Design a protein around this ligand. Structure first.
Ligand SMILES: CC(C)(COP(=O)(O)OP(=O)(O)OC[C@H]1O[C@@H](n2cnc3c(N)ncnc32)[C@@H](O)[C@@H]1OP(=O)(O)O)[C@@H](O)C(=O)NCCC(=O)NCCS
Ligand SMILES: [Cl-]
Ligand SMILES: [Mg+2]
Ligand SMILES: [Zn+2]
Ligand SMILES: [Zn+2]
Lengths: 392, 133, 392, 134
């Protein structure tokens, strides 16, 4: 979507991710308050619209989040959004759109989910409840695993190659207190963890996690009004739905990630080789590796070379998953799309301490999809391009 | 108290009452010629007029995965796959057989068998694919 | 929300409501196809954005709807929305905002739900034990029953007065093929139906149903280019969230309905006495009766007189629930808010045959709420004001 | 779970003195803006986190109520619940003790304790209710 005027991110908020006993509304409130405090918002009557993403908790998630903050009322329209894993990013997108269009000057996007207090472990997520593949036993682990099986078949890549994605993402998360899993793990430990959906072992699968994040956005004047020192400019943001058909698509490509990232490059005027950090939908190791090529970070056929050469870690062309990705945070469906943005903002601002990317990134991209719909690789895709917005 | 299905699904799997070999059914749009599984309207041109097309019983495993952690309530392990048919249609289905035995591009054949338990705890019989001789 | 430029409704769509054996995606697609065909759209990708409301079917309902029309892809950003019963109206609202702000010139809102095909525990329709009133045994019918008891205490309304809301609404629906329950029902049948929470009997409560509706909206220029004969102007539309507090409230009022309707009158420049038809959130008989006052159709305390005088049926100041309301359609959570708008458009256009209001209405208002944790009246409220937009 | 579910609701709302004194409901008043409310992490009016504990009246008044014949799963029917207004201008949702077809709006009622539901271990949760005075 082209932005009709400039839109900037002021404060962001993030909970620690993992197994929480407090529910989605508490997590969401904590992230939202953190984002408001980071925006020098000290009163319930300042934000002008709110969007809240969620997957499976509630039909009124945002009203539940804001209830205890005294912010629900006639001057805060709240709308909740869903597109499976895109929802947290779509919430920020909706907030951006309100500001860019002049419907508001100050809005907030929240993504939140609690899964673990509402389900039993020992089972994977199915596809959509009404989907034909769900009837036949589809689980999201196996849906991505099939992409790895085919990739291995076509390229000769081994399970040990795919495992390097977990090693790197966990390394990135080592000093990040928000991540669930982190630190040093070997290829051998990744590959010898229990098989989940061949060839995806446990440590190549994102966790089923709880967490929340929030992003306050506003106009250029509103940043100044609030005294925001390091406003982050939204250079572009794009939402697509996934092509549907029952033909034999190449699942080592990704129709919607390819077209969404190209549109983002075109609208923002920023090409893939200019992106310094990237948070993407690393729900499984194979996804990150495939998206190096789908997003144009490297040429066709060079995804594994890109990884092996260090181009997606510190010192390379683009640090991918610097917060640790979904493979370290786990993935609360409604939260991840907003959480990527909160951490990208902190990296742009130099605020990530022991996991801070150097040199400080100036351009940060994020990507979440959302699936379970037969005949689509993903039902939805949302990508944001963010850049430094404070001069020197 | 009305009973749960035991077969999935007459719009895609034909079982000849004469005892003929079962087959998957496609449909060809009369207006534009697009072949697809059964639909109310054509995704290409929105026509509602189709001809039924029996599909090949033989296909190729495009990809598969051996599933050790399943959906809630499903016995494990099981196997599912994208099976590509000569008519350029891709079917999602379970594969009969053992983990650690399938390969991409393996030829397979349609077969009927249980895919899950229904809410009366009777098997739901549906389409699967199996190895050929 | 003030509209930055005029927005008009072109085609609308509506399925039959009741127990369906086709799911939410089939229903939603039927309604979307009708609305697009009713807009004279020859190029489906003229539709530049789609919003779909749902309550509990799935997380990718709009993509599941549009995939069977061949419309998913890079040229159709789809966002799904939720605010319990507000969702279908919010979907139309999001589409209107896209057009009003110039993000798009043509957009679509769909509301869809299938409940009866799916095992929904009963806990999905209620809040968690975490909610203080739920911890103490609250059920929705008892919450509204308390509103009825207080109204009887203050006005002398009897259970027979309340039952006349069901009688009226089913009467209105007699010749409406989309409605589920319809025709003559006697007051004694309503009053003698099983008591749920005094004074609410079963026939005074809307039931669960399956259905969908859709609304295409576009700019003035797009109405001319599509050759739309009777474009319906969006005179105004408002979304609010419900205030939270624990002070005594007058529950024969409705804080958020009062403020939402007042804001709708102020923004649209159309007052309540000018409204010719009204669809509202008649989840229980008492709600429609109170909303006569809450919306300013009559003064505080006068809702009982308004009802008895016939002011809310044919010939009166405002025909309320002319399609039959939730009390005749049932209530597919994601559908109702869109369905109200579809039927109001048909009434404005004179198209409703045996249930058509005469003389033809020129001003139509719609209202859904949704949710309501402890300390709130409702979580959300969405209202639309629609007027004839064609000349003579 | 062999770690027990709750048997009482809720220590920050219903004060049960350890020396056996009569229980009472309590609120918390914001020290910055003066808003009275039940216990909350931050004032919903002004976002202050600084409060004073306010014991509440044990006498209240039924603002409205309903006799519940079809209610929540697992609760014995019929039961009764109500909005009970306190003179400090706070509204409490609570079950009423007694029989159906006996309460009226604006009736005076008094705080009492009793089981409001069974917990996940099928043991009663004890909490506040209100009852007729005479
Ligand atoms: C892989 C998966 C099936 C494992 O779940 P599981 O087998 O049920 O495992 P459990 O939840 O019972 O946890 C077992 C232990 O392993 C760990 N663990 C769980 N999941 C883990 C994961 N994905 N990675 C690493 N460790 C994990 C521990 O947390 C846990 O120990 P704990 O009791 O101290 O918390 C599950 O994580 C999964 O399905 N992931 C994919 C989710 C998905 O598809 N998201 C949508 C993507 S689009
Ligand atoms: Cl996905
Ligand atoms: Mg087209
Ligand atoms: Zn066709
Ligand atoms: Zn205060």
């Amino acid at each position: 979507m082209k932005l009709q005027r400039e839109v900037y991110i002021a404060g962001v908020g993030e909970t620690k991710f993992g197994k929480h006993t407090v529910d989605f509304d508490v997590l969401g409130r904590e992230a939202a308050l953190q984002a408001m405090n980071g925006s020098n918002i000290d009163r319930p009557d300042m934000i002008q619209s709110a969007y809240v993403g969620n997957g499976m908790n509630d039909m009124t998630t945002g009203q539940a989040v804001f209830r205890g903050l005294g912010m629900c009322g006639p001057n805060l329209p709240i709308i909740n959004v869903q597109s499976a894993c895109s929802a947290g990013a779509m919430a920020v997108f909706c907030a951006i759109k309100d500001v860019a269009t002049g419907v508001t000057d100050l809005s907030i996007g929240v993504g939140t989910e609690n899964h673990t207090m509402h389900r039993q472990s020992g089972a994977a997520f199915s596809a959509a409840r009404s989907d034909i593949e769900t009837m036949h036993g589809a689980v999201m682990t196996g849906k991505y695993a099939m992409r790895a099986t085919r990739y291995m078949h076509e390229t000769g890549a081994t399970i040990e190659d795919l495992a390097m994605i977990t090693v790197k993402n966990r390394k990135h998360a080592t000093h990040n207190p928000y991540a669930w899993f982190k630190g040093a793990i070997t290829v051998e430990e990744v590959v010898n963890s229990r098989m989940v959906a061949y060839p995806m072992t446990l440590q190549q699968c994102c966790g089923i996690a709880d967490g929340a994040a929030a992003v306050v956005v506003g106009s250029k004047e509103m940043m100044k009004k609030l005294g925001i020192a390091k406003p982050v400019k939204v250079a572009g943001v794009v939402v697509e739905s996934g092509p549907y058909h029952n033909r034999p698509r190449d699942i080592t490509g990704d129709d919607i990630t390819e077209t969404t990232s190209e549109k983002l490059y075109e609208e923002s005027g920023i090409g893939p080789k200019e992106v310094n950090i990237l948070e993407l939908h690393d729900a499984f190791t194979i996804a990150e590796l495939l998206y190096y090529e789908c997003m144009g970070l490297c040429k066709k056929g060079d995804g594994l070379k890109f990884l092996r050469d260090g181009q997606s870690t510190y010192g390379g062309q683009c640090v991918v998953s610097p917060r640790g990705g979904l493979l370290s945070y786990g993935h609360p469906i409604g939260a991840s799309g907003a959480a990527q943005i909160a951490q990208n903002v902190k990296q742009l601002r130099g605020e990530c301490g022991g996991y801070q990317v150097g040199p400080t990134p100036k351009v940060a991209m994020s990507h979440v999809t959302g699936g379970g719909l037969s005949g689509t690789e993903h039902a939805a895709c949302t990508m944001h391009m963010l850049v430094k917005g404070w001069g020197s | 108290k009305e009973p749960d299905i035991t077969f999935f699904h007459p719009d895609i799997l034909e079982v000849p009452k004469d005892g003929g070999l079962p087959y998957l059914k496609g449909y060809r749009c009369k207006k534009c010629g697009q072949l697809d599984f059964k639909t109310e309207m054509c995704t290409n041109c929105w026509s509602e007029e189709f001809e039924m097309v029996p599909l090949s019983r033989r296909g190729k495993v495009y990809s598969f995965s051996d599933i050790y952690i399943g959906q809630q309530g499903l016995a494990t392990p099981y196997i599912f796959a994208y099976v590509d048919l000569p008519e350029n249609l891709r079917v999602f289905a379970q594969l009969e057989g053992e983990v650690d035995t399938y390969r991409c591009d393996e030829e397979v054949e349609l077969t009927l068998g249980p895919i899950r338990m229904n809410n009366d705890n009777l098997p739901i019989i549906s389409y699967k694919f199996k190895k050929i001789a």
